[PDB]
């Protein structure tokens, strides 16, 4: 323009390429957003209910293929026959089975005693891991509703109870609705009310890491800003280890014995798992917790194989490399490998080629090559969410954990290139400089294979900080019964005498602002940590002393109730301006108000005792011409405490001259107007 | 985010100095060169001026309508953008905005309400206008400065409500004219804020 | 000299509908580069005006890609793609060819489209308690009319008359017009209007 | 051996018998038969896809949403070609009852 | 020389925007890429094969 | 979608004339100032000349190396880049590009290799390369022009054959030396293409 | 005067693993708008050009995320965050401030990594129908070395020309055939090399 020859054109350009940086971030942030797992709940066999007791079966080296299941009432005796070609006998004679399939609380989920009975396990488990993955998110469960927040969950569809066409006498129609995979998405989408994407997708044993790899998909885009990504195989008849032993697929002992020279086939066992997932910077804008970030995911069928179970070993390169260049990493940046490792004979000899040609390519750093079912048992469709749930406790305990079978490997397979160290021993795993990046890989019998690259969370330096002790706030507990109320405090009461000197205002904000406002109340505002423990104990029988205890139906709905006189004492509110400033300042506003209408000010009135407001030109209650504002004021000021609380009146009513305070709080008359 | 907050508004009598302050944060200020872009009340935007960046001199380039009066700064190190507004006159007063390019306009700011007004704070004179035999309306002539807020039955009628932007007379007051549309007998509290007087009509033919 | 830009200053908009705002210049806005130097800028109503699109056709980022851009050196287009109640204010073509420019055109009034209305003239003859303040006030209230483009007259004459006009609402989508004769203590001892709404002047007095 | 998705949308309901009880010959094959999971892996290994051949369970919106699932594996480029569909053949009066 | 900055910005600025152009054009083929339907098989109800 | 496909390489004398065409497709060609960049066999890029934009007008700057010698030119009605090369010498024996700009050089053609040498068409004179007592290798000394040929065993040991890249001498010739490293005997096939010279080497130590 | 831009000329990759290829200018090379005038280009062995990343920190559309730029105008640094196949070649430094420019730089001379390799040296003596042909050769070859900085001296200097071939793929080593174009007396009067392959000069003659 004047200067030069460049003072216009060299703004047109600054724009072209802020601009070209917002619109190439735009396509980092499509197709390569990170996915942070924002949470993790899981129903492992090992009596397995949290994560915290999974990293208490992988790190202690437990295997939790105990035995086959006797809380339904199997007909074990047949499933075992000298003869193995009986049509209804099992070769499994064990396997990792839980007992959290024949238990449910229908009552909490909304469900009559007899809609639930026909709710397939595989569904129930979900509607439980639902509410938890989300209690332990933060995210209180009950408040996504009409949020874009979609359930993918993996399911292989397992048959529950009477056929559709044989209808018992309480389940009729809901047996087709309560066990259809349909609505083991949709039953979590309906009760915790999200309105996203709500797809039970199907791909065997990898829909738990093709519902996890739909999900990611689904939140790069966006259609959903948040996401549940799973899957469940709870096997409710033994109709699934007496097909598969009928092609000699089982081992005669229930375990996955990956990588080893005893290998047997699968080790069947049956679990669940549920991801909360959202895009990183959703999850650190919101302040959700990050454990780990899914970088990528690849969904590739094993094509023409050998046969429909069989497994293809150039499918799974091109997944180890499709989900290695969409994450935007390398083959040597993947620390440890979460492997299916099937404990096949023919897989995973087919499965680990398959790794030394996808990872063990010249690797600096041997490849730790681990397989949670080996410790837990093949999840099934749960299986590759039960690896990013060991590789995600992996991250954050900084210990790679045993593949407890695998001391003698297996001579099919060619471990000379020192590329990938099978883990054997726990191998420790520290946050260095590099990220901390693993593999699970999820391939299944239809011929499905599915690779998830995750990497550890962003290291957070400061985030939630200390800032100094103060003023306790209540300890909120509510529960659907008043059961699981006693439980509440008796669970929570637990998790301070396991983690004592737990921050109060800690156990005040991830139960108040972690939870759901549930029906059967017990909050208790305690002094503290050990007043509270008592308090705890105390409503673990049912006793409430310094508890509030009450029930409600998700009632809300205050209303301030406003006394007009009767309730001064002689020193009101001497400490609560003094405690907090929302109280003291909450009476300035009234006391500028109440400056140009009344001499005497309220600043001092409340502040000084009856003992000591002798001296000061007000009497403690006879002054009505003063008393009588300061009530209104001290009436004003409290109020807006409430408000300031979060507790908002559906109604204000007055008496006499708390009609006053109450046209004050209402808006029709200014604080002003009806302080004058 | 690039931010361009503003501040730096007021009330003046004409020939005062006045300081217009644009906070910038989220780009580089010494690259960009900042312009200060007028809207006077319900008109099309006018340029005021704009600062070359340091690196392209620092020169500053105003209209032929302020030369002499307006000057414009810039400093990173405190990475505020200054419009200095001496010897106002009565057309200062407008929204005076603060946008991050001298030919190229981004950011543009929020729009910082200056006034150059030769009045004082009076409260309204509240002028019914009785239906012709229809609407019922009342006028709230020679008030300021603006806020005003005009509802029709306290707040309880709002079908038909039209409250008139306020209009400037040549004696520097303002005059807003609220009418309601309504077959009948109807109350109208004009609320002069900077002065609380509020002012009650009732109206009849 | 200096370049004349001119637009379609009172484009209509329905929403759902693409609609088109042009760009005319005198001269011509291709500068040697094979860019043009002409802008689109959006006030949004009662808002920081916006950079819709720079050097002609480039739409700047966080700007909805309905708003499409092209043009010669001296006829240009913006093309909305697709007009939502967000896409109404003025649409200022805005040229970068010479700088400095004192104003940023009379800018493209766009609103909300509906048909013709009827422009509700209402005369309120002043409050006798004002001619008791000392001033005078008749008041020609139009009411619900859309096209704004009403000439509103004071005869048996005008200059004395002083404009009042709010945008357009969103059930009715219509304007109002306020055009006050604030006035003087004698010379009180009619108004009508020209807008499309009617045809014929319909002239109602005090 | 192309980069080719199978998305089909189908309801578990309930073909042959109970797989506890197995069968004559439908023995080893009964599971591969009553499966979604295969009922879009049996397809892309007939042909040879070596897309994400993956299965949909939202009942009667199955198949829409195996189109759309489709639609983004072509919007993002995961498969250059996909098969999206739904099936329900009702062997069984079960879901009528 | 090349005549100073007028030939130059002005060349980086058909790229940064010859970029933009092909970077947004990205943007709308990752969101909203129109997929075909290539062809359509149905058995349906009745004699539809 | 843009390319830049070039033609006009080929062999000439010191002392000659040539012409070096880029056809344009894709873009707007009277847009962009276009360049001529050239590679001498296996060194870094030298830039020879650009013509700029006939919207910007301008001129055509040269190097120092070529001015006087070389003229640049351009046609939008027929969207052709010109580098007519005049007065050639021994230094012109390169690859010639042509690419999209006179100071951002976007696009870029396959690169004519543009050739002036003083030799005439002669095969081979393949010398064989006896071993000490190891490796067994043949050269192809004085052969001209490029292409060149020489597998071993006729096309059957393809491992540890390195074919030893042209090397020009002051005569003009081309020189490869092609060798195969194995313990023992083998047999080395020159075919010189312009000419059809095909011969072939037993070597033993 | 003019910008001197150098680089690392000879640095090594090894794929997989993120490189930094830096360029050091004399002149400063950030411009008034804020800018820097630097430009990377590559050119992959026996291509056409192509650009990478202009204005010193802009990737060129068409180039892949791995090619990043960060640094000012005098000391930049091209980051490649992932070295497959694809990233290597002649990476030039290339500024835009002053352009008349000659030259594309040196340019940075990118290889495939391995460890160091001990170049075998095969002293040939020329054929001797060739000294019945007029000419003499004798040929010293390096062949499988790896990095390529190995010169071949003539002993007991100066005629000696030069054939190196790009790096191979199986061993990615280099080979070079020095060659002692000759005349036919002076045959009747040995080769060795420096390349820290080894460290003492291995000297084998005719």
Request: hydrophobic share 40%; with cysteine; proline share 6%.
């Amino acid at each position: 323009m004047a200067s030069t020859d460049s003072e216009k054109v060299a703004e047109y350009l600054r724009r072209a390429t802020l601009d070209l940086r917002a619109a190439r971030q735009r396509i980092r942030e499509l197709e390569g957003e990170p996915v942070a797992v924002v949470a993790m709940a899981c129903r492992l066999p090992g009596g397995v209910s949290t994560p915290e007791e999974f990293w208490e079966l992988l790190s202690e080296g437990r295997d939790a293929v105990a035995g086959l299941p006797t809380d339904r009432g199997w007909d074990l005796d047949s499933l075992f026959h000298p003869d193995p070609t009986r049509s209804g006998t099992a070769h499994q004679r064990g396997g990792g089975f839980l007992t959290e399939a024949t238990a449910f609380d229908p009552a909490f989920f909304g469900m009559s005693p007899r809609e639930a009975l026909a709710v397939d396990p595989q569904q129930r488990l979900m509607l439980e891991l639902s509410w938890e993955v989300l209690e332990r998110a933060g995210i209180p469960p009950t408040s996504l509703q009409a949020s874009p927040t979609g359930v993918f969950v993996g399911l292989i569809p397992q048959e529950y109870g009477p056929r559709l066409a044989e209808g018992g006498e309480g389940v009729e129609g809901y047996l087709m609705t309560g066990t259809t995979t349909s609505v083991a998405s949709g039953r979590i989408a309906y009760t915790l009310g999200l309105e996203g994407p709500a797809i039970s997708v199907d791909t065997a044993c990898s829909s738990s890491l093709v519902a996890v790899h739909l999900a990611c998909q689904s939140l790069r885009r966006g259609e959903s800003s948040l996401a549940m990504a799973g899957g469940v195989t709870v096997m409710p008849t033994p109709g699934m280890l007496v097909d598969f032993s009928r092609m000699n697929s089982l081992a005669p002992d229930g375990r996955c014995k990956a990588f080893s020279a005893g290998a047997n086939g699968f080790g069947m066992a049956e679990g669940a798992g549920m991801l909360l997932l959202e895009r990183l910077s959703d999850a650190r804008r919101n302040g959700h917790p990050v454990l780990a970030v899914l970088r990528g995911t690849a969904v590739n069928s094993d094509g023409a194989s050998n046969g429909l179970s069989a497994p293809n070993g150039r499918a799974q390169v091109r997944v180890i490399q499709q989900a290695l260049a969409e994450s935007g990493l390398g083959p040597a940046d993947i620390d440890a490998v979460e492997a299916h490792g099937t404990g096949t004979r023919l897989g995973d000899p087919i499965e680990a080629r398959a790794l030394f040609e996808a990872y063990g390519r010249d690797r600096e750093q041997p490849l730790h090559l681990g397989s949670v079912k080996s410790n837990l048992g093949h999840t099934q469709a749960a299986a590759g969410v039960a690896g990013v749930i060991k590789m995600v406790l992996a991250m954050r305990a900084g210990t790679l954990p045993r593949t407890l079978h695998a001391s003698e490997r297996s001579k099919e397979i060619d471990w000379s290139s020192g590329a990938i160290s099978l883990l054997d021993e726990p191998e420790p795993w520290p946050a260095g400089a590099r990220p901390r990046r693993a593999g699970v890989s999820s391939f299944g019998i239809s011929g499905t294979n599915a690779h998830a690259i995750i990497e550890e969370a962003p290291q957070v330096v400061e985030g939630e900080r200390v800032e100094a002790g103060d003023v306790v706030a209540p300890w909120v507990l509510s529960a659907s019964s008043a059961e699981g109320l006693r439980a509440q405090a008796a669970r929570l009461a637990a998790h301070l005498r396991e983690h004592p000197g737990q921050d109060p205002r800690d156990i005040a904000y991830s139960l108040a602002t972690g939870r759901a406002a549930l029906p059967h109340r017990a909050a208790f505002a305690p002094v503290d940590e050990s007043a509270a423990l008592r308090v705890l104990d105390g409503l673990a029988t049912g006793n409430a002393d310094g508890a509030a205890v009450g029930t409600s139906r998700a009632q809300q709905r205050a209303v301030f109730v406003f006394p007009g006189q009767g309730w001064q004492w002689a020193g009101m509110a001497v400490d609560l301006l003094d405690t907090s400033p929302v109280f003291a300042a909450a009476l300035r506003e009234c006391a500028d108000a109440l400056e140009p209408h009344l001499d005497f000010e309220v600043i001092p009135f409340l502040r000084a005792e009856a003992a000591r407001r002798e001296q000061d030109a007000a009497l403690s209650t006879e002054r009505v011409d003063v008393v009588q504002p300061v009530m209104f004021a001290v009436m004003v000021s409290l109020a807006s405490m409430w408000r300031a609380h979060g507790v908002e009146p559906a109604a204000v009513i007055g008496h006499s001259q708390g009609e006053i305070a109450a046209a004050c709080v209402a808006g029709a008359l200014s604080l002003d107007d009806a302080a004058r | 985010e690039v931010q361009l907050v503003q501040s730096g508004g007021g009330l003046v009598q004409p020939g005062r100095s006045l300081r217009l302050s644009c906070t910038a944060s989220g780009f580089t200020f010494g690259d960009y060169a900042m312009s200060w872009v007028r809207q006077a009340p319900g008109k099309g935007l006018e340029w005021v001026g704009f600062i070359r960046s340091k690196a392209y001199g620092g020169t500053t380039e105003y209209a032929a309508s302020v030369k002499g009066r307006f000057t414009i700064s810039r400093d990173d190190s405190k990475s505020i953008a200054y419009l200095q507004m001496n010897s106002l006159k009565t057309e200062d007063t407008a929204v005076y905005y603060c946008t991050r390019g001298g030919t190229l306009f981004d950011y543009w700011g929020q729009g910082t309400l200056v006034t150059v007004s030769s009045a004082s704070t009076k409260g309204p004179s509240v002028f019914p206008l009785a239906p012709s035999s229809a609407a019922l309306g009342c006028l709230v002539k020679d008030y300021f400065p603006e806020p005003v807020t005009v509802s029709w039955n306290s707040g309880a009628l709002t079908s038909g409500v039209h409250t008139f932007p306020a209009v400037l007379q040549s004696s520097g007051l303002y005059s807003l004219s609220s009418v309601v549309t309504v077959p009948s007998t109807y109350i109208c509290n004009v609320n002069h804020k900077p002065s609380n007087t509020k002012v009650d009509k009732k109206v009849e033919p | 000299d200096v370049v004349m830009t001119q637009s379609p200053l009172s484009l209509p908009v329905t929403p759902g509908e693409p609609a088109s705002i042009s760009c005319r210049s005198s001269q011509s806005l291709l500068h040697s580069n094979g860019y043009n130097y002409l802008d689109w800028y959006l006030q949004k109503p009662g808002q920081s005006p916006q950079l819709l699109i720079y050097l002609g056709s480039n739409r700047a980022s966080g700007v909805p890609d309905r708003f499409s851009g092209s043009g010669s050196g001296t006829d240009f287009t913006l093309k909305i793609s697709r007009v939502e109640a967000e896409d109404v204010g003025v649409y200022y073509c805005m040229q970068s060819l010479q700088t400095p420019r004192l104003t940023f055109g009379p800018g493209t009034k766009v609103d909300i489209k509906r048909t013709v209305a009827a422009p509700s003239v209402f005369i309120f003859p002043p409050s006798d308690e004002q001619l008791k303040s000392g001033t005078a006030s008749v008041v020609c209230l139009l009411n619900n009319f859309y096209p704004r483009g009403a000439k509103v007259q004071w005869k048996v004459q005008s200059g004395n008359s002083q404009e009042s006009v709010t945008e357009q609402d969103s059930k009715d989508s219509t304007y109002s017009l306020s055009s006050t004769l604030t006035l003087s203590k004698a010379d009180y001892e009619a108004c009508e209007v020209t807008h499309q709404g009617l045809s014929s002047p319909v002239t109602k007095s005090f």
